[PDB]
């Protein structure tokens, strides 16, 4: 199970760290401290008939 909030993910640190999500086609503000956050997609399909 995922559990409760432990890290503050939205301390911007006085930075204006815009990222443009090419997926959502929108700008988001990253925190000042997160190392990376990126929006490239993978899709995996497994399909079985018996």
């Amino acid at each position: 199970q995922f559990r409760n909030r432990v890290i503050n993910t939205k301390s911007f640190g006085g930075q204006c760290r815009k990222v443009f999500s090419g997926d959502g086609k929108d700008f988001y503000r990253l925190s000042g401290n997160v190392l990376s956050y990126t929006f490239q997609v993978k899709i995996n399909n497994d399909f079985n008939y018996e």
Binding site: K42, I43, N44, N45, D46, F47, N48, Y49, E50
Partner: protein, 47 residues
């Protein structure tokens, strides 16, 4: 189809006696069978 059938006749005169008998039997068997089986599988994996 199988049949076995016999007929017997006798007359004797000396007094007169006669006996005649006919016996017949038929046997038939038929059996019919049919069966069908089909199987199939698909796997599809896409990335």
């Amino acid at each position: 189809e199988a049949k076995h059938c016999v007929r017997i006749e006798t007359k004797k005169r000396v007094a007169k006696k006669t006996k005649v008998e006919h016996r017949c039997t038929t046997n038939k068997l038929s059996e019919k069978h049919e069966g069908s089986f089909i199987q199939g599988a698909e796997k599809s994996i896409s990335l």
